[PDB]
From Swiss-Prot, chains A, B, C, D, E, F, G, H, I, J, K, L, M, N, O, P, Q, R, S, T, U, V:
Principal place of residence: secreted
Protein name from the UniProt record: Type 3 secretion system needle filament protein
InterPro entries (UniProt xref): T3SS_needle-like, T3SS_needle-like_sf, T3SS_needle_YscF
GO CC annotation, single: type III protein secretion system complex
Pfam family, one: T3SS_needle_F
Gene Ontology annotations of biological process type: protein secretion by the type III secretion system
Keyword field: Plasmid, Protein transport, Secreted, Transport, Virulence
Family per similarity comment: Belongs to the SctF family.
Length: 82, 82, 82, 82, 82, 82, 82, 82, 82, 82, 82, 82, 82, 82, 82, 82, 82, 82, 82, 82, 82, 82
């Protein structure tokens, strides 16, 4: 009915956000990676550069965790499932 | 008689609402889940993220309670029975 | 004679109404129940949700009183007896 | 006599209702089917999607039970016989 | 009778939804396709880009499965048959 | 007698439905036609756009079959004859 | 008779409206409350925020008067009695 | 009925706003905190940095009052209850 | 119906993006070309300057592949078809 | 009867869509035209700029085909006739 | 609703400006102070160095009036209140 | 009936606008105030800063007229009464 | 004889109407009452809300005159006596 | 008889419309009033704002003519008398 | 309605521009004035320094025409009226 | 009947559009006026600035034709009459 | 004899019809009157609104001819005499 | 007899439709007129704007043919005569 | 309807772009002119300075072709017509 | 929803600033260190060179406090958490 | 749309660079030429003075290759075309 | 959608940075190389001149490592992939 397309609408929008967030993550990923290379001097950038991301605790570093970066996008649809 | 289809009509509409509400719940579910992941920083979102839902007291968190989310849809028809 | 089928007619119609009213009650029952769940926020809906029904005084809440809801239909035929 | 057409009238109306209910069932059937496809995410819809229908207990799912959906219409006339 | 146009009404609406969903799928299809081309960098988008769609399990990728995208619209009327 | 106007009544109503269905068909016809033009991209819409209508099997496409669309209205009265 | 279900119908609809109005009031209530918190700067919002509601004179502020907000729903059925 | 999903809709939207406001608060929180650290020189920033927030009177400083920042989000749903 | 303009809307927006991306590609194209000429010294820029673009693998060089640059815009509408 | 205004309603809505689509076409027309002038550099835009529109195959270019653009609006009512 | 976050947005931006202006004032403050010390020779710089600031009339000298400099930032939020 | 919630709907929306306008006024108020302070140099800003607002004639200056700014919000509901 | 049941028939029907009218009055009563509360703004509704009912002259307001509303039903049987 | 409740029905419905129209007028009234205040700039809105309403000739401005706005509702029942 | 805040939005933005332009004029004013003083040598700067501004013909010199500079800001709102 | 409020609805909406268009015209009016003043250099803007508006032929310039701008709003209601 | 009550019966029924027709006329009268007021725009409604009624030729307008409306009821009994 | 009011009923309903259609025509009339003015650019709208209406062939343009628009309403009653 | 303001919106935006492009052209025009005067040495700048602009082929030189520069703005609205 | 990417946006920007500040700190760090080595003569530079940084009180010396310099970057994300 | 001015912006900037590079080339050209004349002694300067410029291989000597120097500027726009 | 061009934007900017950094590296490369040749005396410059670059540890010497210098640019896009 009307109801159905609602879900499509919501899902569509929702999925949209997910992609955006991930892509945003991608964007950051570029930045993060660049920084370390750019400025070797400060190890911290590197430290940030490589890390795991716990959601709350950690600062996600896209480059550091390949899985994380990839994970979000694929994850997101799973999240959609959730 | 006329009467019968009335029930069908009512039931149909009523059931319709239930699905909608649940789906709406689903929609929120997506949002809720996303938020926590999106913003690790604020634990509250997470706090909201995971909780039980009492109907009145609690704010339902779809993701937090899988059972809750699922529960509503199946519940609803039961509610129809009620 | 003619007279007899009159009673059948009347009774039939009358019974018809009873079922309708009850069913209507059922329909409301669905609505009422849904509302409380739907909107936890307003306790009043819940308050309405659970109550006894005096005929005059009370607002009947089908869900609140299982007996009431059931009662009407069975009652109605009794009423027919009355 | 007069009496005869009464039965025709009643039967006609009665049959009418049956068709309506079934058709209504058909209508729901469309909705139900659509929902699952539409929203894969919530398994419940699927769960509802496939089930048997006991009259009282179960929520009938037209698509799930082909026999059920078909059954009602043909059944109804049988019911008329009843 | 009245009943007939009901089916037409329902069917009409129902069919309407189907088209909408499919079209929505089309809309997503455009987005999905674009994304991969747009951002080569993240393979995931591509991964999403090409996949089969199980209804529940999979995330449907319109572009990936031509059949899927087409399938829904034609399917939908079949669904109407269902 | 009374009987006669009954037929008129029935016929009138019945004819009414027929017109409605056809008109409904007309309404769909507009939609169907529009869709294909509107969205060239999905051939399916076009595919639907042009087809024969078997009653059961086919999805009727008003625009595709001029005869079909016209057919129903004129047919309907014939149906009345039937 | 017919008459009876009429009352049920009317009452049902009428009650429906009442709930809607109240709920609407609830909706506003959320808005009203939010505004004051949101914008501390303008005291007026606060002023509106807290007030009594005379029906005609006053602008009802749900949050300001808890009793008012609650009052309407329960009141409404009383109104039904009226 | 229709009415129910209305509440869901309203609530959903309303809740949405709350999250936004809080998040906005979060955003400011980041800014506020940064400023003080960034510019030690002007104590005022610090002064702003730490304070209580009365709603009207005070300028809320997220960092200064941890409780405040957290409070809003959780509060908001409570507000929803209100 | 409503549905139709939806497609137009989506298509319009979608097409819009495509043009933007291509144009963006154009913009880059200008930059890329300029760089090589500007800085002969670093062959890499030239190397980048001329290449094929695989979507994922390659870095697209607009100038290097005339076809690629042109391709996207025309392609995009095709993509719209897809 | 009721039936008649139905057609008016449908027709009205349907016609509404047509105008919208055409107007949308107009809107695109403005964009399309502008682009070519704006960016001479990319011939493709021009190429798109001038073309015939087959419905499926071609990308319609309003400016390129004056007839096409005009055609749709006038056509649409004809389509209404269809 | 939407409306609420608007205020947050506006307020956020507005507050942002205030801080900027003040900070700018701070920046000038540094310059102003430096100048006098730097160039003792020209008393005017000193004269400028110390003064009250009327908004219109006076040239504000941050260093001269400690209160003024501080005043703006704290003032600004008050201004926000205004 | 239906009618009632219409008023609620209208009123709700209407009230919504009023708040928005006022808030907008608030937003401007912030800007206006800031400007004068920011740029003492141009008296005009100040001139604008302080003035009465006739509706048509005058340019309203929120800060200049406290009453005006406040007035609108409270006024608006009165306007609602009107 | 035959004659007697005639009176019963007539009386029964007649009484039926009376109840209906009164109930109808009741229905209006609900509406009328609701309106005033619903829309405080227009005093007229209130004005209508409270009034006496002359039969011809006045518009009866059930809520305004309790006696009137009650009066009709009891009156009606008296009317039957008349 | 049957006839009587017919009048009640008609009157009820008819009265319903009147209220609706008036209320609608009220709704417009809010809009109209708002506009002038909102946009002082265009005197026309004001011009519209204040005017008499001839039924045919004039555009009714609720706010401009208090009597008019009020008039309709009270008038309507008179109209009912008519 | 929605419409109203549109005007506010537009007006707000529009007014914003006006202020900006004027302020820009102010900025130029500073520059212009400075130049003449700075470089006495070239009379032209002075010549530019003092002049009337026709809109098209003349180059506006803020300092030269006090009225002009002031005029724009106040004018602008008038322009808003226009 | 139902029919009446339909006209009100339509008229209301229709009138709404008119105001919007006019207001939009107003908005443009502001822009148009500003441009000429802003950029004296290009006479064309001025040329556009002052002109008559034929509906089709001319580009309407609100400022140029006072009558035109005013005309639309008042006209619109006349148009409503049409 | 039997014969007498026949006349009473016939007369009673006949009179009944007359009242109904007149009342129906009354009902239309309400509608007719409303329409003109409701839609000033179309003079035709007004034209219809005021007219004489020849029986065959004219369309009776109750409101237009007070005498006509009244006339029918009183007339009817006269007609009974006829 | 019964028969008579039947005609009244039918006529009443039938007339009702006519008015509706005409009014609908009126509604379209508003739209049609608006469009041309709104969008001068597309002559087609104008072309549609002015035309004769053959019933089948032509698309009726209310504004274009004053007579047509008026004609329908008055015509309709004539049609009733037919 | 809604549709109309859409065109206004689109047109408004579209026109906006045109002005921008032209103005941009104006901006370039200033630059281009300046360059030649500034650097007599390189004839190329002059060569660029004076030329015709074919859209694709030529590089437009505003100063060189007065008509071109002017042309765009006026043209643009024509383009709007297109 | 929209909301989510907002946080990403804000966070992204916010994080960006943090890095910048830290990096800026790094830049200063280089300068500070260099100075002392460069100019042994003035101990003050050295004194500045080595110190703790309280935020307000102290002048941070990156080199002096290794922890401080490092601290900011890592801290910043923590700050983000804050 | 927005998109268009983007191209203008990009193109404008891009073109800007080209001119700059060429001009820079011009600047070098002056230097290069001067050097040879200035220092006859070192033939190398002369050798550099006259040469062809391959982009990568050669060091461009503006004076040596007149065509080269000129070429870049004109070329650049061509490059823009590219 | 919007989202797509975001990536393009980000990527474009990001890529821009990479080129800049590399080019910067190129610039340094020139300096570094020059220094050693310029000042043979200090071997350190030479030592710096030739080295490997670890990112953190080493100071990159463009000339020393040809691969490094080249590597960055090509690498960067790879980094983009990352």
């Amino acid at each position: 009915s009307v109801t159905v397309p609602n879900d499509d609408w919501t899902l569509s929008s929702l999925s949209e956000t997910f992609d955006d967030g991930t892509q945003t993550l991608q964007g950051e990923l570029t930045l993060a990676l660049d920084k370390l290379a750019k400025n070797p001097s400060n190890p911290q950038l590197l430290a940030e550069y490589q890390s795991k991301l716990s959601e709350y605790t950690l600062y996600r570093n896209a480059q550091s965790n390949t899985v994380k970066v990839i994970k979000d996008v694929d994850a997101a649809i799973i999240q959609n499932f959730r």
